[PDB]
Structures are given as C-alpha cells and as structure tokens.
Short mmCIF file of C-alpha atoms and ligand atoms in Angstrom, two decimals:
data_model
loop_
_atom_site.label_atom_id
_atom_site.label_comp_id
_atom_site.label_asym_id
_atom_site.label_seq_id
_atom_site.Cartn_x
_atom_site.Cartn_y
_atom_site.Cartn_z
CA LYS A 36 148.15 86.05 220.74
CA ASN A 37 148.71 83.49 223.50
CA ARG A 38 150.52 85.19 226.43
CA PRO A 39 151.80 83.08 229.36
CA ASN A 40 150.87 85.60 232.02
CA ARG A 41 147.25 86.15 231.02
CA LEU A 42 144.98 83.49 232.57
CA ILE A 43 141.30 82.54 232.81
CA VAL A 44 139.69 82.77 236.23
CA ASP A 45 138.32 79.54 237.68
CA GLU A 46 136.60 78.57 240.93
CA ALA A 47 138.94 77.58 243.77
CA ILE A 48 139.10 74.42 245.90
CA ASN A 49 141.05 76.35 248.52
CA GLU A 50 138.83 79.02 250.08
CA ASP A 51 141.72 80.75 251.91
CA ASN A 52 141.51 84.44 250.97
CA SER A 53 145.20 84.84 250.25
CA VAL A 54 145.55 81.95 247.86
CA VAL A 55 145.57 81.47 244.14
CA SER A 56 146.52 78.22 242.35
CA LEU A 57 148.17 77.27 239.02
CA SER A 58 149.29 74.10 237.31
CA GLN A 59 152.91 73.23 238.01
CA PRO A 60 153.98 73.70 234.40
CA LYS A 61 152.52 77.19 234.65
CA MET A 62 154.45 78.06 237.83
CA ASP A 63 157.57 76.59 236.37
CA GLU A 64 157.07 78.68 233.26
CA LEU A 65 156.53 81.88 235.18
CA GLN A 66 159.37 80.83 237.47
CA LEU A 67 157.33 80.79 240.65
CA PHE A 68 157.58 78.71 243.80
CA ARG A 69 154.98 77.78 246.42
CA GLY A 70 154.76 80.70 248.84
CA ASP A 71 155.59 83.33 246.22
CA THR A 72 153.68 86.57 246.28
CA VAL A 73 151.99 87.59 243.05
CA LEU A 74 150.38 90.75 241.81
CA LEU A 75 147.08 90.05 240.00
CA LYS A 76 145.56 92.62 237.67
CA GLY A 77 141.82 92.53 236.98
CA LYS A 78 138.90 94.57 235.65
CA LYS A 79 138.31 98.26 236.45
CA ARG A 80 142.04 98.39 237.13
CA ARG A 81 141.69 96.58 240.45
CA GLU A 82 144.79 94.83 241.74
CA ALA A 83 145.29 92.10 244.34
CA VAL A 84 148.26 90.46 246.00
CA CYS A 85 148.20 86.74 246.60
CA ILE A 86 150.13 83.67 247.56
CA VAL A 87 150.43 81.21 244.68
CA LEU A 88 150.17 77.45 245.24
CA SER A 89 150.51 74.45 242.95
CA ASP A 90 147.28 72.65 242.05
CA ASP A 91 147.42 69.55 239.83
CA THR A 92 143.82 69.65 238.61
CA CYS A 93 144.49 73.13 237.32
CA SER A 94 144.71 73.66 233.60
CA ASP A 95 147.94 75.15 232.42
CA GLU A 96 146.08 78.31 231.51
CA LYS A 97 143.57 78.46 234.34
CA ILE A 98 143.78 80.20 237.69
CA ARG A 99 141.67 79.02 240.62
CA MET A 100 140.72 81.78 243.04
CA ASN A 101 138.19 82.20 245.87
CA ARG A 102 135.55 84.89 245.39
CA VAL A 103 137.09 87.20 247.97
CA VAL A 104 139.85 87.72 245.46
CA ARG A 105 137.57 87.65 242.41
CA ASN A 106 135.53 90.32 244.11
CA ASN A 107 138.64 92.29 244.97
CA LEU A 108 139.62 91.97 241.31
CA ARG A 109 136.05 92.68 240.10
CA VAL A 110 136.08 89.56 237.96
CA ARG A 111 133.99 86.44 237.57
CA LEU A 112 134.54 82.89 236.35
CA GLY A 113 136.15 82.80 232.91
CA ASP A 114 137.30 86.44 233.00
CA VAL A 115 140.93 87.15 232.24
CA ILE A 116 143.49 88.38 234.72
CA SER A 117 147.14 89.30 234.40
CA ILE A 118 149.65 87.76 236.84
CA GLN A 119 153.14 89.01 237.78
CA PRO A 120 155.59 88.11 240.48
CA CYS A 121 155.95 90.54 243.36
CA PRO A 122 159.54 90.22 244.59
CA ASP A 123 159.96 93.72 246.11
CA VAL A 124 157.11 93.12 248.56
CA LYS A 125 157.94 93.92 252.16
CA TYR A 126 156.82 92.98 255.68
CA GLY A 127 154.38 95.57 256.97
CA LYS A 128 155.20 98.13 259.64
CA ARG A 129 151.61 99.16 260.20
CA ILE A 130 148.25 98.42 258.73
CA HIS A 131 144.99 100.25 259.22
CA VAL A 132 141.79 98.25 258.62
CA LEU A 133 138.21 99.24 259.23
CA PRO A 134 135.48 96.73 259.95
CA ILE A 135 132.34 96.85 257.76
CA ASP A 136 129.16 97.66 259.75
CA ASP A 137 126.44 95.97 257.66
CA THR A 138 123.93 95.27 260.40
CA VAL A 139 121.85 97.01 263.02
CA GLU A 140 123.50 95.97 266.27
CA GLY A 141 126.85 96.59 264.67
CA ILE A 142 129.56 94.31 265.95
CA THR A 143 131.20 93.63 269.26
CA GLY A 144 133.58 93.54 270.78
CA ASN A 145 137.32 93.05 270.45
CA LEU A 146 137.75 92.64 266.71
CA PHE A 147 141.50 92.24 267.12
CA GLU A 148 141.57 89.22 269.40
CA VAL A 149 138.47 87.62 267.81
CA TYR A 150 139.03 88.23 264.15
CA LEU A 151 142.32 89.81 263.20
CA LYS A 152 144.75 87.96 265.46
CA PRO A 153 143.37 84.54 264.49
CA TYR A 154 143.12 85.47 260.79
CA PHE A 155 146.59 87.00 260.40
CA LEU A 156 148.53 84.99 262.95
CA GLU A 157 150.11 82.15 261.00
CA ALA A 158 149.85 83.08 257.42
CA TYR A 159 152.10 85.97 256.54
CA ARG A 160 149.19 87.18 254.40
CA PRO A 161 149.85 89.73 251.64
CA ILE A 162 147.36 92.64 251.58
CA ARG A 163 146.75 95.83 249.57
CA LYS A 164 145.16 99.20 250.21
CA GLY A 165 141.48 98.72 249.36
CA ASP A 166 141.18 94.95 249.73
CA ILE A 167 138.00 93.72 251.30
CA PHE A 168 138.41 90.47 253.17
CA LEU A 169 136.20 88.22 255.20
CA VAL A 170 137.10 86.61 258.50
CA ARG A 171 135.10 83.55 259.52
CA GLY A 172 134.81 84.42 263.21
CA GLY A 173 132.94 83.50 266.35
CA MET A 174 129.19 83.76 265.78
CA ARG A 175 129.47 85.57 262.41
CA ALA A 176 131.99 86.38 259.77
CA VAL A 177 133.08 90.01 259.60
CA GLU A 178 134.41 91.95 256.65
CA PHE A 179 137.22 94.51 256.81
CA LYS A 180 138.44 97.01 254.29
CA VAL A 181 142.16 97.74 254.18
CA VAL A 182 142.37 101.49 254.68
CA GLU A 183 146.12 101.62 254.33
CA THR A 184 149.47 99.93 254.56
CA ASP A 185 152.85 101.18 255.68
CA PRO A 186 154.54 100.50 253.45
CA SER A 187 151.96 101.66 250.88
CA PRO A 188 150.13 100.36 248.99
CA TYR A 189 150.76 96.68 249.76
CA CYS A 190 152.65 94.49 252.27
CA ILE A 191 152.96 91.27 254.22
CA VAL A 192 151.40 91.23 257.64
CA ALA A 193 154.14 89.81 259.81
CA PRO A 194 154.00 89.00 263.53
CA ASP A 195 155.47 92.41 264.41
CA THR A 196 153.23 94.24 261.94
CA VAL A 197 151.10 96.76 263.84
CA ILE A 198 147.41 96.41 263.14
CA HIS A 199 145.07 99.26 264.00
CA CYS A 200 141.31 98.75 263.72
CA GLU A 201 138.86 101.68 263.95
CA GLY A 202 137.19 101.30 267.37
CA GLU A 203 139.80 98.54 267.81
CL1 LIG B 145 147.09 103.12 261.12
CO1 LIG B 146 146.37 104.47 264.28
#
C-alpha cells in the first residue's frame, strides 16, 4: 500500500490551466522543483502534462488541480491520479489546435491574436495531443482541442513554436 506518486485529486486555488500544486514535502520527496513539467495519469487512460507548483495548504498526499485538467484527466474530486516527472519534454516546433464551435454564430475572428497569443505568450505551457483547454478571451471564453504536436504527442509551446489554428 501507500505509494508516494499516487495522489488524491483536490480543488485548486490557482485556476491556471497548466498548473497543479503539491505540498513542499511532497515535491521534495518526488524530487521536483517549481516549474517542473509532470505527466499525470488519470481515468480511462487519459494523460495530461502540467507545471507543478508548491502550495502550503496542500496535504502531503493531495493534489490541487483546476477542472480543465480534471476534465482532461477524466477525474473528479477525491479520485486518484498517478504523477511522474517529465524530463525529456521538448519545446514545440509546431502545434495544431482547432477551436470548438459550440454556438450558432460560431466565433470570430482572429483566434490567434485574441486567444492563442495572449494565452500562450508568457507561460511556456506544456500541452498534449487531445487536451481541451479554455481561453478566457474578449467577450467570451473559447475552447480549443489540441489536434497534434510536433514533437508528438506532447511539448512546451515556446515563443518560436508555430501555432496553426483551423480557419486561423
Ligand atoms: Cl499543424
Ligand atoms: Co498547418
């Protein structure tokens, strides 16, 4: 019983889509530093790639995550996920995302300048093929699915990372 890399999901205080949080003893045990990329394994064999931060109100065996990640992981509060470091992870050459058209009227107009540039610029966000993420944009949030990454199947969107969006 007991394992150090299996943890119980818990609601996050940080709503940033790329962030998960652990106690400091936990990070120190798993030998992780703030900014480190982790692979999370959830239910229905869904996997996510996150940035891990230290939270001091976090129980040594809890993991706080926003629901964008929980949803990507197909888990809910109190479920159990597996966490591993992701050292080999690389800066992305290209990424292909498609925006989710949920509404009549679709969405306009330049998704790149309005959503993607502002969302990705800054953060060196880690992403995976098949992630669904939500950008709080002008007028309305928009969701995108990650169609693919080069390199596949996951990577860090860097400032020189090419980002193609369907209609663009
Ligand atoms: Cl592409
Ligand atoms: Co293309």
